[PDB]
Amino acid sequence: GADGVGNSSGNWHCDSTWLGDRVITTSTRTWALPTYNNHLYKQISNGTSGGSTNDNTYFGYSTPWGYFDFNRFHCHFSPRDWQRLINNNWGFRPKRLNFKLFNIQVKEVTTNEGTKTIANNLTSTVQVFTDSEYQLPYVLGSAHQGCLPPFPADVFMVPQYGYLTLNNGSQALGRSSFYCLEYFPSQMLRTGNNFQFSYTFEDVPFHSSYAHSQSLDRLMNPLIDQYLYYLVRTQTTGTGGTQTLAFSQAGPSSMANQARNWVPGPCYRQQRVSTTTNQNNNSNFAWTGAAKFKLNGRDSLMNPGVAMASHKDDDDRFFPSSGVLIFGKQGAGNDGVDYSQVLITDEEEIKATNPVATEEYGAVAINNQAANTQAQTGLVHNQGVIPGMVWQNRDVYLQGPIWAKIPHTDGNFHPSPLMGGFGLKHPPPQILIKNTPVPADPPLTFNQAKLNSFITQYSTGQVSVEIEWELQKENSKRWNPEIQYTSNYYKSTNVDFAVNTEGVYSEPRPIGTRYLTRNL
Amino acid sequence: GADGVGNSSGNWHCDSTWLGDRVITTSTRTWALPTYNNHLYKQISNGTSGGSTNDNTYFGYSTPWGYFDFNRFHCHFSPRDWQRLINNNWGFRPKRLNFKLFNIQVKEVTTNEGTKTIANNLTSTVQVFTDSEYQLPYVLGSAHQGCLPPFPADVFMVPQYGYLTLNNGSQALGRSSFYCLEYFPSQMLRTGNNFQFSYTFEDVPFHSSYAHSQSLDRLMNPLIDQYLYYLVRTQTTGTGGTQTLAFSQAGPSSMANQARNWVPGPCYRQQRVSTTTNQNNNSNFAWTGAAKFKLNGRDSLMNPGVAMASHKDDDDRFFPSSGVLIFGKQGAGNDGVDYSQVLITDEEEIKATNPVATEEYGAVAINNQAANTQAQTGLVHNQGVIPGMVWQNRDVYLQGPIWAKIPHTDGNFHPSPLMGGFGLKHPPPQILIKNTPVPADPPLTFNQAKLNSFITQYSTGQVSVEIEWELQKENSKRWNPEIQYTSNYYKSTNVDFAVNTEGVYSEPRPIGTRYLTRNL
Ligand SMILES: Nc1ncnc2c1ncn2[C@H]1C[C@H](O)[C@@H](COP(=O)(O)O)O1
Ligand SMILES: Nc1ncnc2c1ncn2[C@H]1C[C@H](O)[C@@H](COP(=O)(O)O)O1
Ligand SMILES: [Cl-]
Ligand SMILES: [Cl-]
Ligand code: NA
Ligand code: NA
């Protein structure tokens, strides 16, 4: 038969294939969908009143719908695969994908007298649809939990969909928009029924898997001397102290002086903090210290900020308070976890072209030099883009994000997601799922009221995401061995990126993308 | 319909057909699959610490998967069939096979208040796949229990899959590899869904079902005398005792002296032990006595060793402590069972070309003979292969193993499984099965955690293995009746290879392969 209950409505594909440039990832996981909001759209707001501050106010709605998110690299990549990709390519980018939902099973749970039994409702349905026109608030790219699990074996719960609208305090404005998912043409399923579609990534720039092997400043030959001169002295050396103009040709020895065609990238000052406890000043400056941007009278934290080097050499302990991504160690607590639990990423690789996060961009003269007045200079903590700058985008990690929807705005600049990734105008459409409400027996005499009693049930099934990535091979003529991600030989009680003695896959550290080195 | 619940998704084939050389075996058994490891991959290690010795240390993983093993002769052969094959062929070998899984039924068991009920989950699925590329640690050929039952009627449990990786003590090394079965493209089934495939055995040498009827030493005509001489005496006979060189032509009477073109096979000394209790020395030399090979600082027992004759004639009671296969009598206990329970196989058939297990290979001179110094000789307990050797491989039994995967190594010698069988580089692929986890109702509010609650269920179904064997008929011109496996006429209370009064099929003794005799 075509579609029956005693028939697999799809298969399990979890494979990675490398041919030439194209690497194909395929993942399958087993999901479970709870009933959300008792089949109800609820208005949710957080007020100014009460303990909560004004910066955490919001207005929105929580829907009875769940959504499928695969926006995390680890979903499509095995740790071993991530290794192959990082260690041999100068870049890569998504090309197309394929989604599938199958072997859907709906169960109805009954409880009597502390006795609980779960069996099948076959006639029951499950609704699915894609926001192919992008008419629904984009949830994804907010780094929200609920993406497919990293380990294929694990079975996961489907995230609940909800959105935010313009708000003043705990109130909404005239502008704020209320969306109803049901007002969307969605496809329905019964077990033996399957859903699926395909999408093709708009053209996007290859991510850089290469870390520079020349600093922006050191772009010139040591042996030669520039044909240009610079002002070397305003005053005669020694006792005389009489103003004079002396000019010198910037040479190899005087490298700093010599003129350059390109200058470092932009910077927003980030407060510095040291892993060692003692060094830090004894105040709770987590918030007061941190850089932030104020929008509509509300100050939001600048996380994770513009792309900047985490630390200057040998300052490894240092990190921006808010200027890097942080990943919890497995089993880590959501609130107030200790330092040991967290994995603080490090973006030092990009130090060569990008400004250090914790230091000034540089200095600019504050006044005209005078016969009486002395020259002055001021520091640059906040530096915007100017002609001649070059820079590197923030890195993605095996457990990082992949893409993000570029806001539909009149304009924007270098729209590469600040958390790292590919910026798409038309990203993979949001996939929405929901269990169709099955009413409990209605009262015998007609009632104008809307039914408030339903059979309790949840659904389960497999999901498949297959993505085709385009690689960009290395062309380096570097004579010496390059740096590469490896797993240390030395013995240990547990294996890296494996299950422990209890059956708990764990990702020991974040894994960057740039190991291979390319010239500037 | 094509695939429905009320439809047999396969039939029962249990037949043997003989045409010409080709004998075709077909078996079908009914299996049951329990849930394994609560749907969890678990890290398993045995430590140096505690009672366990260092030689029993290991590191590995236990998977939620089960595997189908047919690697035992009795599965495909009826005892009567084994008889026909052994009693009329000089050899045979596997040619191709066909596997099938069908009539899959998944049951979900419920327990309330000490009340247990088992019914059907139809929408539930079962995953299956073959390691057609050999990317998974090879379990088979380790003589592990869990192969299809010998008796067709019996219903069996499916073995759990698990593997081992490089370990130091209870720790893993950097090299050690962790495999995830789910990362394998596997096919899913619902009842009315069936799986199946075919494989063809790489070319392999016919097993020898023939026992030699000439000793390697006695390969020459009695009547004739060799045209070659040997050194018969170093000293004059009688009183004189003065050195002289005397040479004689090796004749029929002096058979031992005469030169030969071929010499016996290799040997590793095996400690001798007698079935009679009194003869044996009163010490627990089971381990201390036994020969062993030390790998990576760990001593493993040499079981079952190289192929060697169990005993010289009339030494029938004797056997190598570790140098023969042992099969438990039906109902025999796993640990510390008495001698009566066990069936100790006997490889005396091969004594003619192979060295006796318990005796030295022979002797070699230890020094140069001297006018003053006397000649000396030393025994050879360990003897490696040298030009001119010929030997017989170890026999397979009706309840023995069939093939084994030749380790993917740079080199090897005469790669015939030491436990007996056919050595294949690409053996029948491991067949992996697993019940797909069906989650218990999830909590209403999204949780980042991985689901830990599942409906309890197991599966059942029929399995079919069909193998085509190629025979090699006897060509003997032997005038007298040959020895053959028979069942003794004399009355008994139970029939050989039948069920007893309780319904317990039992294999009374091991059944060899070599009865027919061929010349050397
Ligand atoms: N990841 C990503 N997504 C979307 N747009 C991006 C991305 N990275 C850079 N850009 C911007 C930068 C330029 O404005 C343009 C490509 O020009 P070019 O001269 O090639 O830099 O796209
Ligand atoms: N059972 C089995 N499996 C695999 N390889 C085997 C087996 N028996 C012997 N051999 C080896 C011995 C030789 O190296 C080769 C066949 O050569 P020949 O001159 O025919 O002995 O194969
Ligand atoms: Cl976490
Ligand atoms: Cl047994
Ligand atoms: Na709510
Ligand atoms: Na276990």
Side-chain angles (χ1 to χ4, degrees):
Chain A
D3 285 284
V5 171
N7 200 308
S8 174
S9 49
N11 271 312
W12 183 283
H13 313 274
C14 213
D15 204 20
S16 70
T17 59
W18 302 71
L19 34 70
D21 47 349
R22 333 290 291 199
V23 59
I24 298 184
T25 70
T26 300
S27 277
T28 300
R29 301 287 184 280
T30 301
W31 56 263
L33 186 55
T35 301
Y36 277 78
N37 280 358
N38 196 333
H39 317 284
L40 265 178
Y41 277 75
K42 285 187 172 187
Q43 186 185 83
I44 70 176
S45 58
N46 185 197
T48 180
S49 64
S52 59
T53 171
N54 168 68
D55 306 48
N56 288 299
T57 61
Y58 64 74
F59 186 94
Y61 295 93
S62 58
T63 68
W65 293 72
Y67 69 92
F68 284 95
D69 172 13
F70 35 68
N71 183 351
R72 262 171 150 303
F73 274 94
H74 61 234
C75 304
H76 321 276
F77 283 106
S78 51
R80 168 48 188 166
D81 281 336
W82 189 249
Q83 172 163 47
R84 297 168 176 161
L85 170 62
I86 50 183
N87 279 54
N88 301 94
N89 310 286
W90 271 348
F92 66 87
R93 70 183 183 191
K95 277 309 195 71
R96 77 184 42 173
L97 73 54
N98 207 294
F99 187 77
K100 311 181 195 73
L101 267 207
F102 49 90
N103 291 311
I104 309 196
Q105 339 182 182
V106 161
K107 298 276 193 295
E108 75 184 311
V109 58
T110 296
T111 54
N112 295 338
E113 71 281 5
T115 306
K116 193 182 74 177
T117 44
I118 298 177
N120 307 281
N121 180 359
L122 305 180
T123 53
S124 190
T125 59
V126 155
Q127 310 178 61
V128 166
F129 83 89
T130 54
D131 191 12
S132 64
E133 304 201 39
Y134 306 102
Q135 302 150 136
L136 268 185
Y138 206 71
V139 179
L140 314 188
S142 293
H144 291 287
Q145 298 153 40
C147 305
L148 299 157
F151 194 66
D154 294 349
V155 179
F156 75 131
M157 175 177 232
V158 180
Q160 186 179 316
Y161 181 71
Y163 56 85
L164 297 193
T165 294
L166 291 175
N167 64 34
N168 186 160
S170 34
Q171 292 193 301
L173 312 190
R175 288 190 185 88
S176 296
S177 296
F178 165 58
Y179 300 94
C180 186
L181 267 47
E182 264 62 20
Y183 185 44
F184 268 151
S186 60
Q187 184 204 312
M188 305 183 101
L189 304 159
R190 282 185 170 178
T191 175
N193 264 192
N194 72 78
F195 166 73
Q196 83 109 68
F197 76 108
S198 307
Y199 157 66
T200 299
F201 292 82
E202 42 185 60
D203 245 316
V204 63
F206 288 50
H207 175 80
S208 45
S209 56
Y210 61 83
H212 294 291
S213 63
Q214 273 176 294
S215 54
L216 196 178
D217 48 11
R218 308 279 107 99
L219 283 184
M220 33 47 185
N221 180 354
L223 328 193
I224 304 313
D225 301 15
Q226 298 183 4
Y227 43 102
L228 292 68
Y229 300 68
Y230 66 87
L231 218 172
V232 60
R233 279 190 301 284
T234 307
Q235 167 193 62
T236 65
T237 53
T239 52
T242 50
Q243 319 81 352
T244 184
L245 277 64
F247 301 109
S248 291
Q249 270 178 161
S253 175
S254 68
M255 303 212 313
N257 295 16
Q258 66 183 23
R260 298 180 180 78
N261 277 308
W262 319 108
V263 73
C267 77
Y268 207 75
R269 177 62 87 102
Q270 273 290 20
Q271 187 50 270
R272 181 185 68 178
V273 28
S274 167
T275 74
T276 298
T277 57
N278 27 312
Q279 293 177 335
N280 300 343
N281 172 7
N282 182 356
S283 52
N284 177 358
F285 63 86
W287 175 282
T288 60
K292 26 194 160 57
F293 68 78
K294 197 167 188 172
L295 181 292
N296 187 7
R298 73 165 61 95
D299 300 294
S300 296
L301 164 51
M302 252 286 283
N303 206 313
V306 200
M308 300 171 266
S310 296
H311 58 262
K312 71 177 183 181
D313 290 64
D314 303 308
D315 281 13
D316 303 341
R317 53 191 190 275
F318 295 72
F319 70 80
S321 57
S322 70
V324 207
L325 303 178
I326 296 183
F327 299 110
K329 286 188 178 183
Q330 179 287 338
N334 72 3
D335 173 294
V337 296
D338 182 12
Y339 166 90
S340 65
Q341 315 288 201
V342 299
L343 311 184
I344 294 182
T345 63
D346 192 299
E347 292 281 32
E348 137 279 296
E349 301 97 47
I350 72 182
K351 58 182 181 297
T353 46
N354 295 51
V356 188
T358 72
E359 285 181 344
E360 349 82 14
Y361 180 77
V364 304
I366 305 176
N367 67 4
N368 296 132
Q369 76 82 358
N372 53 297
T373 315
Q374 307 212 304
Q376 297 180 60
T377 56
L379 290 188
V380 184
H381 304 288
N382 172 50
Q383 170 62 297
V385 180
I386 70 188
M389 297 187 129
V390 299
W391 64 86
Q392 220 60 178
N393 286 354
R394 173 180 301 275
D395 191 336
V396 291
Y397 304 76
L398 177 57
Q399 67 275 66
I402 312 182
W403 65 75
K405 171 178 151 51
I406 296 168
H408 187 71
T409 57
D410 279 358
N412 51 55
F413 181 62
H414 206 65
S416 199
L418 279 148
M419 300 202 272
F422 305 94
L424 311 190
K425 293 191 174 185
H426 309 294
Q430 313 194 69
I431 311 175
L432 299 167
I433 190 168
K434 179 205 176 195
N435 297 155
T436 298
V438 178
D441 53 344
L444 304 178
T445 60
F446 169 84
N447 191 3
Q448 188 185 187
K450 75 173 189 180
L451 282 295
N452 63 167
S453 177
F454 306 94
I455 296 181
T456 299
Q457 39 183 50
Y458 63 89
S459 55
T460 206
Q462 285 59 279
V463 56
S464 280
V465 173
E466 174 194 318
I467 302 181
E468 186 189 11
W469 309 78
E470 177 176 50
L471 300 174
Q472 164 181 152
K473 294 303 175 182
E474 74 152 0
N475 201 356
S476 183
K477 288 300 290 186
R478 181 180 184 187
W479 179 271
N480 56 74
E482 296 188 46
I483 326 176
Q484 297 203 299
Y485 179 98
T486 177
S487 180
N488 49 1
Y489 174 55
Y490 190 81
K491 60 187 177 180
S492 175
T493 59
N494 302 285
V495 194
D496 270 0
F497 298 91
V499 298
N500 75 108
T501 84
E502 300 301 49
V504 194
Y505 176 64
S506 59
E507 302 185 313
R509 71 189 57 65
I511 295 180
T513 208
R514 9 222 191 181
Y515 287 64
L516 296 183
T517 88
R518 190 217 290 264
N519 289 284
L520 243 192
Chain B
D3 285 284
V5 171
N7 200 308
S8 174
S9 50
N11 271 312
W12 183 283
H13 313 274
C14 213
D15 204 20
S16 70
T17 59
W18 302 71
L19 34 70
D21 47 349
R22 333 290 291 199
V23 59
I24 298 184
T25 70
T26 300
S27 277
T28 300
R29 301 287 184 280
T30 301
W31 56 263
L33 186 55
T35 301
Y36 277 78
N37 280 358
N38 196 333
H39 317 284
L40 265 178
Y41 277 75
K42 285 187 172 187
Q43 186 185 83
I44 70 176
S45 58
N46 185 197
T48 180
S49 64
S52 59
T53 171
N54 168 68
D55 306 48
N56 288 299
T57 61
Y58 64 74
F59 186 94
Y61 295 93
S62 58
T63 68
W65 293 72
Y67 69 92
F68 284 95
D69 172 13
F70 35 68
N71 183 351
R72 262 171 150 303
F73 274 94
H74 61 234
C75 304
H76 321 276
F77 283 106
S78 51
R80 168 48 188 166
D81 281 336
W82 189 249
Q83 172 163 47
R84 297 168 176 161
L85 170 62
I86 50 183
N87 279 54
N88 301 94
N89 310 286
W90 271 348
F92 66 87
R93 70 183 183 191
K95 277 309 195 71
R96 77 184 42 173
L97 73 54
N98 207 294
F99 187 77
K100 311 181 195 73
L101 267 207
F102 49 90
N103 291 311
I104 309 196
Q105 339 182 182
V106 161
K107 298 276 193 295
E108 75 183 311
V109 58
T110 296
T111 54
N112 295 338
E113 71 281 5
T115 306
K116 193 182 74 177
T117 44
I118 298 177
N120 307 281
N121 180 359
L122 305 180
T123 53
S124 190
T125 59
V126 155
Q127 310 178 61
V128 166
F129 83 89
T130 54
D131 191 12
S132 64
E133 304 201 39
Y134 306 102
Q135 301 150 136
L136 268 185
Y138 206 71
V139 179
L140 314 188
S142 293
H144 291 287
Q145 298 153 40
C147 305
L148 299 157
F151 194 66
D154 294 349
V155 179
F156 75 131
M157 175 177 232
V158 180
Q160 186 179 316
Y161 181 71
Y163 56 85
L164 297 193
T165 294
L166 291 175
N167 64 34
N168 186 160
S170 34
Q171 292 193 301
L173 312 190
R175 288 190 185 88
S176 296
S177 296
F178 165 58
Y179 300 94
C180 186
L181 267 47
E182 264 62 20
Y183 185 44
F184 268 151
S186 60
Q187 184 204 312
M188 305 183 101
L189 304 159
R190 282 185 170 178
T191 175
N193 264 192
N194 72 78
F195 166 73
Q196 83 109 68
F197 76 108
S198 307
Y199 157 66
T200 299
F201 292 82
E202 42 185 60
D203 245 316
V204 63
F206 288 50
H207 175 80
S208 45
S209 56
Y210 61 83
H212 294 291
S213 63
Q214 273 176 294
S215 54
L216 196 178
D217 48 11
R218 308 279 107 99
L219 283 184
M220 33 47 185
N221 180 354
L223 328 193
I224 304 313
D225 301 15
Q226 298 183 4
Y227 43 102
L228 292 68
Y229 300 68
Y230 65 87
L231 218 172
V232 60
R233 279 190 301 284
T234 307
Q235 167 193 62
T236 65
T237 53
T239 52
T242 50
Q243 319 81 352
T244 184
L245 277 64
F247 301 109
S248 291
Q249 270 178 161
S253 175
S254 68
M255 303 212 313
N257 295 16
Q258 66 183 23
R260 298 180 180 78
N261 277 308
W262 319 108
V263 73
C267 77
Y268 207 75
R269 177 62 87 102
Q270 273 290 20
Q271 187 50 270
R272 181 185 68 178
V273 28
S274 167
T275 74
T276 298
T277 57
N278 27 312
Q279 293 177 335
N280 300 343
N281 172 7
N282 182 356
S283 52
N284 177 358
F285 63 86
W287 175 282
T288 60
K292 26 194 160 57
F293 68 78
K294 197 167 188 172
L295 181 292
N296 187 7
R298 73 165 61 95
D299 300 294
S300 296
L301 164 51
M302 252 286 283
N303 206 313
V306 200
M308 300 171 266
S310 296
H311 58 262
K312 71 177 183 181
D313 290 64
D314 303 308
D315 281 13
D316 303 341
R317 53 191 190 275
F318 295 72
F319 70 80
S321 57
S322 70
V324 207
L325 303 178
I326 296 183
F327 299 110
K329 286 188 178 183
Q330 179 287 338
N334 72 3
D335 173 294
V337 296
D338 182 12
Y339 166 90
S340 65
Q341 315 288 201
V342 299
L343 311 184
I344 294 182
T345 63
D346 192 299
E347 292 281 32
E348 137 279 296
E349 301 97 47
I350 71 182
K351 58 182 181 297
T353 46
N354 295 51
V356 188
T358 72
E359 285 181 344
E360 349 82 14
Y361 180 77
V364 304
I366 305 176
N367 67 4
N368 296 132
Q369 76 82 358
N372 54 296
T373 315
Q374 307 212 304
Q376 297 180 60
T377 56
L379 290 188
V380 184
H381 304 288
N382 172 50
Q383 170 62 297
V385 180
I386 70 188
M389 297 187 129
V390 299
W391 64 86
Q392 220 60 178
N393 286 354
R394 173 180 301 275
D395 191 336
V396 291
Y397 304 76
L398 177 57
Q399 67 275 66
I402 312 182
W403 65 75
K405 171 178 151 51
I406 296 168
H408 187 71
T409 57
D410 279 358
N412 51 55
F413 181 62
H414 206 65
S416 199
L418 279 148
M419 300 202 272
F422 305 94
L424 311 190
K425 293 191 174 185
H426 309 294
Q430 313 194 69
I431 311 175
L432 299 167
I433 190 168
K434 179 205 176 195
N435 297 155
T436 298
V438 178
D441 53 344
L444 304 178
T445 60
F446 169 84
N447 191 3
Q448 188 185 187
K450 75 173 189 180
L451 282 295
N452 63 167
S453 177
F454 306 94
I455 296 181
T456 299
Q457 39 183 50
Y458 63 89
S459 55
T460 206
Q462 285 59 279
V463 56
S464 280
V465 173
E466 174 194 318
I467 302 181
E468 186 189 11
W469 309 78
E470 177 176 50
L471 300 174
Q472 164 181 152
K473 294 303 175 182
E474 74 152 0
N475 201 356
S476 183
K477 288 300 290 186
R478 181 180 184 187
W479 179 271
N480 56 74
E482 296 188 46
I483 326 176
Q484 297 203 299
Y485 179 98
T486 177
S487 180
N488 49 1
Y489 174 55
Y490 190 81
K491 60 187 177 180
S492 175
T493 59
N494 302 285
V495 194
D496 270 0
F497 298 91
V499 298
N500 75 108
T501 84
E502 300 301 49
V504 194
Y505 176 64
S506 59
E507 302 185 313
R509 71 189 57 65
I511 295 180
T513 208
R514 9 222 191 181
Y515 287 64
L516 296 183
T517 88
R518 190 217 290 264
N519 289 284
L520 243 192

